[PDB]
Amino acid sequence: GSMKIDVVTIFPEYLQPVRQSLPGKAIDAGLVDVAVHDLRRWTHDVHKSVDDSPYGGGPGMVMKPTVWGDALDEICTSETLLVVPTPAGYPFTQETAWQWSTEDHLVIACGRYEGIDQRVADDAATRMRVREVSIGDYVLNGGEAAALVIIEAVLRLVPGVLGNASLLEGPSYTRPPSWRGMDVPPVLLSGDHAKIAAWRAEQSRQRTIERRPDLL
């Protein structure tokens, strides 16, 4: 029905267009609020340090637990579902999106792919629900783009929020009936709606075998 989403990131501008994309009707009805927070607000030092070298050595940096702990202490409540995008996560799927669409409060913690110190999520899990999730089998430098994907996939399932109303979907067609020598499949113009459904099912089957044989 209605959802608050807080996003925490060192790149708050990354989230601005998705804020601007919420229809005013949904905001005014109180169906949705998306707030973005600069993680640096919770830094302790004059240099606004958010990361530090990894224990046990090796490359990259790990985000500081003291900074994230303070940020989440402020932003989260007992009702919060804390979402942490990471290539090391459980898979985020359409089933996940449906589940999260009825939450009252998502907090999305965007960090670099080398990680937020694991104690942040471990501590947070003692007082709220935490879900570390991957949006696909690739690495991104940080969680921000994954956050945009999650926000969109979840909110388009909340009635009235984004303005929108197994086997893969097959090809779609519109006017004109002939274009650059390619005709729309004549079955779609036949007025035989049972036949059209069967044709679409076969297109779906062939496409799934070709692109996603894992689904069969």
Place this chain on the structure above:
Amino acid sequence: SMKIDVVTIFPEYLQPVRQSLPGKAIDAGLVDVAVHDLRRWTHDVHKSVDDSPYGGGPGMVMKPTVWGDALDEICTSETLLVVPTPAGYPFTQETAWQWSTEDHLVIACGRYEGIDQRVADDAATRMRVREVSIGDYVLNGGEAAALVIIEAVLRLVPGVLGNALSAASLLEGPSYTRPPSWRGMDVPPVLLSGDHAKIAAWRAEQSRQRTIERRPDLLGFDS
């Protein structure tokens, strides 16, 4: 240098490219990203990009005429045309490595119920075309998927990686940093021990344990 052209009815949604890693790649001159409003190629007063489907169905389908004109202008025979769609082949780390070597990516962002299939089919007669899914979920449009692809590709381009290119199927385990104790929670003592062999072994184990818990498919087990 790589050129990335992104074509969309929401050019504003692509502004995040100027942030973080893509922004740094652009500033370093390793990539040029241009965003084009599809409506530039319309000719009617209402700048129509969509029409109702043939054969029935809810929603609308993006018109082939408008897309064909856009792609004619932007693409060459050397272009790799990328079409994000939940009905695509999977976009994976391997795809990202492959595309990191391309001279020209054009990313065609769809909305509504998708793009008339003849756009991709026509394009494939003159250039390489790849319809790809970034994951098993549905979005309202290709724009967020375009940003994911750009991020995943650009962090692998040689000007970004440097010496790392010349120097996988498992999840990274947990990471830690200072202080060694926080809220009563200690960093695993092995990581403080300075013993490189023991640390490597612990990290490998943690990686395999997290993989079996979170992603058993990666190790060839049932999901």
